[model samples]
Target: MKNRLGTWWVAILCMLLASHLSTVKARGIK
Candidate 1:
C-alpha cells in the first residue's frame, strides 16, 4: 500500500510539473 501511494504521489507531481511547464511556455510565446 505504501508503494502504491508513493507511485501516485509521483504521478501527481509529474502532472503538476508538466502543467506548469506548459503555462510558462505559453507565456513565453506571447
Candidate 2:
C-alpha cells in the first residue's frame, strides 16, 4: 500500500511524542 511508510512513521512519531509529552506535562508545560 502507498500509505505503508507514512503509517509506520506516524506510529513511531506518536510513540516519541507520548514519551516526551509525559516529561513536558510533569514540568507543567501542558
Candidate 3:
C-alpha cells in the first residue's frame, strides 16, 4: 500500500512538472 501511494505521488509530481514545462515553453523561459 505504501509503495502504491508513493507511485501515485510521484506520478502527480511528474505531471505537475510536465505542466510547468509546457507553461514555460508557451511563455518563453526567461
Per-residue alpha-carbon lDDT of model 3 for 1-30, expressed as tens digits?
565586787888888898787665765456
Candidate 3 to truth, TM: 0.46
lDDT of 1 by residue, 1-30 (tens): 565586788888988898787665774467
Best by lDDT: 1
Error at 9, model 3, angstroms: 0.5
Candidate 2 Cα misplacement greater than 4 A, ranges: 1-3, 28-30
**How many residue pairs clash in model 2?**
0
* Lowest lDDT 10-residue stretch of candidate 2: 21-30
TM-scores for the candidates = 0.46, 0.44, 0.46
The local lDDT score (0 to 100) that residue 16 gets in candidate 3 is 86
Clashing pairs in 1: none
Candidate 1 wrong stretches, greater than 4 Å? 1-3, 27-29
lDDT of predicted model 1 = 0.75
